[PDB]
Amino acid sequence: STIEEQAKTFLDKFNHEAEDLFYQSSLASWNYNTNITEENVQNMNNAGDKWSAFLKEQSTLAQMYPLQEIQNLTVKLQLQALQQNGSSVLSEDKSKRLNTILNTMSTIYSTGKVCNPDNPQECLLLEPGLNEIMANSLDYNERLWAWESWRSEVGKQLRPLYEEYVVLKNEMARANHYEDYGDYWRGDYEVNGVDGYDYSRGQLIEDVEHTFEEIKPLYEHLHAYVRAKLMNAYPSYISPIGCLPAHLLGDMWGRFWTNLYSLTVPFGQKPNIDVTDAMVDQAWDAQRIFKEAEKFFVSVGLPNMTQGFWENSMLTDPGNVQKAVCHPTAWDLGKGDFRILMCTKVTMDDFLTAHHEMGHIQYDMAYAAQPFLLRNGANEGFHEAVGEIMSLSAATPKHLKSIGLLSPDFQEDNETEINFLLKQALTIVGTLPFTYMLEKWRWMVFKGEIPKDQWMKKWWEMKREIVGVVEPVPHDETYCDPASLFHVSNDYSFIRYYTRTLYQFQFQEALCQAAKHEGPLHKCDISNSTEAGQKLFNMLRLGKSEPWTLALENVVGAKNMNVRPLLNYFEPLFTWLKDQNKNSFVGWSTDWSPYA
Amino acid sequence: TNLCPFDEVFNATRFASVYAWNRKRISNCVADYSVLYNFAPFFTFKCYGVSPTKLNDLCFTNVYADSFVIRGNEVRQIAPGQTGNIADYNYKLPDDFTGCVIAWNSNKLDSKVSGNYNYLYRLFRKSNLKPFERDISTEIYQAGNKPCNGVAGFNCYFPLRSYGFRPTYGVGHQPYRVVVLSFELLHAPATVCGP
Numbered sequence: 050s051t052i053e054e055q056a057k058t059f060l061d062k063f064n065h066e067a068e069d070l071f072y073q074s075s076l077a078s079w080n081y082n083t084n085i086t087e088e089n090v091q092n093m094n095n096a097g098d099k100w101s102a103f104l105k106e107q108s109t110l111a112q113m114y115p116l117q118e119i120q121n122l123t124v125k126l127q128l129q130a131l132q133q134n135g136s137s138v139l140s141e142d143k144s145k146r147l148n149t150i151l152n153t154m155s156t157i158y159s160t161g162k163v164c165n166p167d168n169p170q171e172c173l174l175l176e177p178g179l180n181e182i183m184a185n186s187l188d189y190n191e192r193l194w195a196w197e198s199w200r201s202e203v204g205k206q207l208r209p210l211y212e213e214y215v216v217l218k219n220e221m222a223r224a225n226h227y228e229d230y231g232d233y234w235r236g237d238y239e240v241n242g243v244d245g246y247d248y249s250r251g252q253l254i255e256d257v258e259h260t261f262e263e264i265k266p267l268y269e270h271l272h273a274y275v276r277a278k279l280m281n282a283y284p285s286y287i288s289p290i291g292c293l294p295a296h297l298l299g300d301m302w303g304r305f306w307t308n309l310y311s312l313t314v315p316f317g318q319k320p321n322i323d324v325t326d327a328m329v330d331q332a333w334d335a336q337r338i339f340k341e342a343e344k345f346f347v348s349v350g351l352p353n354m355t356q357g358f359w360e361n362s363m364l365t366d367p368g369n370v371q372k373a374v375c376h377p378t379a380w381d382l383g384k385g386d387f388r389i390l391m392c393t394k395v396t397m398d399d400f401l402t403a404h405h406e407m408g409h410i411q412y413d414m415a416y417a418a419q420p421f422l423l424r425n426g427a428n429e430g431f432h433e434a435v436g437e438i439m440s441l442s443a444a445t446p447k448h449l450k451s452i453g454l455l456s457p458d459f460q461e462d463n464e465t466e467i468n469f470l471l472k473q474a475l476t477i478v479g480t481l482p483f484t485y486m487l488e489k490w491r492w493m494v495f496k497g498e499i500p501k502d503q504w505m506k507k508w509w510e511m512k513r514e515i516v517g518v519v520e521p522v523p524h525d526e527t528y529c530d531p532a533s534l535f536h537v538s539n540d541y542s543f544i545r546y547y548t549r550t551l552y553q554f555q556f557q558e559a560l561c562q563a564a565k566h567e568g569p570l571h572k573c574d575i576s577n578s579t580e581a582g583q584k585l586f587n588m589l590r591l592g593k594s595e596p597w598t599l600a601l602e603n604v605v606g607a608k609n610m611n612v613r614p615l616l617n618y619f620e621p622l623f624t625w626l627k628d629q630n631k632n633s634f635v636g637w638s639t640d641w642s643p644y645a
Numbered sequence: 646t647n648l649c650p651f652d653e654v655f656n657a658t659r660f661a662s663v664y665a666w667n668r669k670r671i672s673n674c675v676a677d678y679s680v681l682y683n684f685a686p687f688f689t690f691k692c693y694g695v696s697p698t699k700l701n702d703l704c705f706t707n708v709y710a711d712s713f714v715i716r717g718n719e720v721r722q723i724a725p726g727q728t729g730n731i732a733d734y735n736y737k738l739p740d741d742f743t744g745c746v747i748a749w750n751s752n753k754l755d756s757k758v759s760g761n762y763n764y765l766y767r768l769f770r771k772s773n774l775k776p777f778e779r780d781i782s783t784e785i786y787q788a789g790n791k792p793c794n795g796v797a798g799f800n801c802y803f804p805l806r807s808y809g810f811r812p813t814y815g816v817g818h819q820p821y822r823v824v825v826l827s828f829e830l831l832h833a834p835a836t837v838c839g840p
């Protein structure tokens with residue numbers, strides 16, 4: 050009996066025990082998220098605690114098999130994933146110190162409230178209060194207040210915690226033989242022992258930086274056009290050459306420029322495509338939306354939703370007394386139980402999200418045959434990319450016309466396409482410098498390349514330099530502005546939204562190429578193309594079993610993340626932006642700030 | 646002369662665990678083979694060497710009704726020459742298997758919201774199963790080279806795992822009551838006839 054055989058047999062035990070215990074935790078989490086009771090709270094914690102205690106027990110159990118003695122890479126992948134889950138790398142005190150910090154930072158974020166300066170009785174939470182201001186307010190000072198008050202009251206609380214969070218997270222990573230916690234996060238993309246498909250953690254920074262360089266010309270023209278449009282709406286607030294004020298970007302951080310569409314729409318006369326009325330005209334309900342979404346994936350050769358999906362999913366808001374957590378989530382509970390939790394309204398946005406969330410389900414069902422530890426996206430960006438491309442095709446006028454939501458007497462001119470691409474670029478392109486620079490700052494903070502006394506100095510040096518975004522109020526090192534975002538204060542890697550964005554257009558361009566789609570990439574619908582679904586399925590069924598480089602190649606024929614499909618998707622806008630920025634300054638000056 | 650007790654085997658309140666599969670010897674009775682349908686959600690009826698179409702035109706020396714519960718995926722393993730946990734460790738059909746495999750979904754009966762842990766299967770064994778072998782031993786499987794001492798631990802696993810059937814499981818994980826009719830042929834008077 051060798052030791053790989055021991056590990057093989059050990060994983061056999063873990064897979065069967067984990068699937069049962071994970072299912073109990075997932076169903077308990079489901080019952081809470083659809084039936085919010087103090088009981089359903091408790092049962093979720095108990096099942097979650099029993100699942101975590103099992104994982105901690107199995108992580109220690111898995112470590113007794115050293116990795117250098119397993120030749121089977123599939124077994125090593127599952128063994129490594131279970132051992133990398135090993136919490137017993139820090140002392141129980143420092144593990145307890147870190148968990149307390151993570152809970153406190155999570156609590157400060159979710160309960161952090163700011164109150165109106167004139168009347169300190171009325172107080173606002175970030176969601177929905179401050180987010181409502183950041184997404185809808187056109188008033189500079191109110192936006193300046195909510196942006197600054199969130200960072201001054203809640204961000205300053207997180208500064209000492211994040212300082213100690215970095216120390217312990219690095220200590221954890223250094224004990225797992227990673228350079229630092231940023232290197233630990235980049236391990237999600239690491240591939241070893243697979244010749245031709247290997248990928249190092251350091252190579253992620255290079256690939257992100259190399260691909261971001263090709264994003265820069267598109268972003269600068271998008272930044273210049275947005276600045277020109279915002280400058281017209283704020284002549285006294287925005288320099289023609291300066292960075293965009295951080296509070297005037299559509300949300301609390303400028304993570305997405307989606308809510309700038311009203312002020313930056315190229316052709317406000319031409320109406321956007323919104324099939325919401327047509328859905329109500331045809332008496333659509335949530336059942337119809339997901340049936341149409343199910344019909345979309347059937348058209349590409351993917352299986353229909355399981356019988357348990359329709360029975361066990363929550364597709365409408367229970368309303369009445371029964372409250373629910375209405376965040377649209379696709380649930381892989383394991384053991385054939387795939388569900389979607391979604392308080393679906395009869396709207397185009399929820400129609401696309403149903404395609405998006407069912408796209409996750411299709412990913413979940415496809416790798417359901419993989420071992421439990423390998424039932425996930427090829428990397429952290431794959432699952433989100435798979436869901437995104439469904440909403441890409443579902444939102445096209447070709448798809449909306451083919452399903453009777455957009456009448457044939459609608460015709461698409463190049464102005465509505467530029468309108469559509471501008472709205473897409475505000476969300477999709479605008480987030481990439483935000484995502485890269487945020488994760489670059491976190492990478493450098495974990496690496497020790499930014500001292501504590503220059504955290505907010507460098508955070509805003511990079512914001513101006515990389516994102517073209519300037520803080521509206523000077524921030525000393527008592528602030529912690531990254532932690533004012535959920536992912537930073539809730540300990541989530543952020544480069545996944547950069548890689549997913551490049552993956553999704555790599556995916557979409559490849560599937561549209563398989564769909565024999567002629568024309569611009571943004572107009573493409575992969576519907577009725579079994580070749581596109583087959584090419585997608587050859588990756589979806591892989592899960593985590595194969596290297597993400599290979600899973601990427603199984604769709605796009607390329608082993609590495611490529612930005613060209615992203616630029617291909619936005620090229621009609623990019624040429625339009627460069628023409629529209631003819632008599633406008635392209636680029637930005639970091640020295641300019643709205644506080645002079 | 647008397648009706649073969651197929652209702653006992655098929656309509657048993659609780660089927661046996663597949664590791665401890667129930668065997669019922671059917672002999673000296675009339676075998677009404679068209680009664681084998683319980684209006685079940687996913688019925689399966691495949692025979693080997695014998696013809697399910699007009700199965701009641703043949704006498705047999707003995708009929709061995711083997712009943713057990715597996716999940717939906719593992720029903721494919723109840724077939725000659727199949728491989729998997731159930732075939733290797735729980736119920737192996739011979740390559741020359743003469744008989745029928747009747748399987749149907751029992752999510753209504755064998756699934757519970759809290760999880761039905763009545764039905765087990767053998768996850769580990771030092772070797773596979775000979776055709777129609779039955780291993781009900783609960784001896785701790787030895788995966789490592791150290792002793793097991795009769796208790797579960799590191800590299801020493803209890804060889805039986807439970808299905809934990811729940812009604813919300815997928816069809817591939819839902820419980821499936823399986824009856825294997827093994828038709829025996831000997832030099833004997835062949836006392837299981839019946840139209």
Ligand SMILES: *[C@@H]1O[C@H](CO[C@@H]2O[C@@H](C)[C@@H](O)[C@@H](O)[C@@H]2O)[C@@H](O[C@@H]2O[C@H](CO)[C@@H](O[C@@H]3O[C@H](CO)[C@@H](O)[C@H](O)[C@@H]3O)[C@H](O)[C@H]2NC(C)=O)[C@H](O)[C@H]1NC(C)=O
Pocket residue numbers: 074100104133134135378421422424425
């Ligand atoms: C050790 O493993 C746990 C458990 O993760 C689960 O099991 C693994 C073997 C894999 O199969 C995972 O795919 C699977 O989720 C890890 O805990 C998990 O952490 C992630 C991110 O930190 C959580 O994701 C989010 O969790 C929130 C919780 O409210 C959800 O609302 C989000 O939708 C999102 O899913 C995940 O929930 C969490 N798992 C559970 C059961 O809560 C843990 O990170 C890991 N540790 C190490 C060091 O690897």
Ligand SMILES: *[C@@H]1O[C@H](CO)[C@@H](O[C@@H]2O[C@H](CO)[C@@H](O[C@@H]3O[C@H](CO)[C@@H](O)[C@H](O)[C@@H]3O)[C@H](O)[C@H]2NC(C)=O)[C@H](O)[C@H]1NC(C)=O
Pocket residue numbers: 651652653655656679680681682683684
């Ligand atoms: C186990 O119990 C079930 C009851 O839950 C018995 O169900 C019976 O199944 C047979 C199938 O062979 C049925 O006979 C058929 O009825 C249809 C009309 O329903 C008829 O058109 C066919 O020609 C055939 O006769 C039967 O109606 C059904 N119910 C009863 C009460 O018998 C099943 O027979 C039991 N299994 C065994 C092995 O005894």
Ligand SMILES: *[C@@H]1O[C@H](CO)[C@@H](O[C@@H]2O[C@H](CO)[C@@H](O)[C@H](O)[C@H]2NC(C)=O)[C@H](O)[C@H]1NC(C)=O
Pocket residue numbers: 057120121122123124
């Ligand atoms: C790595 O191990 C896996 C199993 O852990 C091997 O794949 C299995 O091969 C057996 C042999 O017939 C099959 O019964 C299984 O169905 C296969 N898959 C699984 C998931 O168990 C695989 O061949 C091994 N690869 C190498 C290079 O050793």
Ligand SMILES: *[C@@H]1O[C@H](CO)[C@@H](O)[C@H](O)[C@H]1NC(C)=O
Pocket residue numbers: 084086087088089371
């Ligand atoms: C919600 O949970 C309560 C118990 O806390 C239970 O009585 C009730 O039936 C549940 N509601 C639904 C719709 O399942």
Ligand SMILES: *[C@@H]1O[C@H](CO)[C@@H](O)[C@H](O)[C@H]1NC(C)=O
Pocket residue numbers: 347352353
């Ligand atoms: C949909 O589910 C049914 C199960 O009733 C199955 O027969 C069918 O093959 C599935 N797919 C399609 C495209 O009909």
Ligand SMILES: *[C@@H]1O[C@H](CO)[C@@H](O)[C@H](O)[C@H]1NC(C)=O
Pocket residue numbers: 463464467625
């Ligand atoms: C659309 O095309 C017409 C010519 O067909 C051209 O005059 C117009 O400027 C174009 N608009 C955009 C936004 O490309």
Ligand SMILES: [Zn+2]
Pocket residue numbers: 405406409433436
């Ligand atoms: Zn998603």
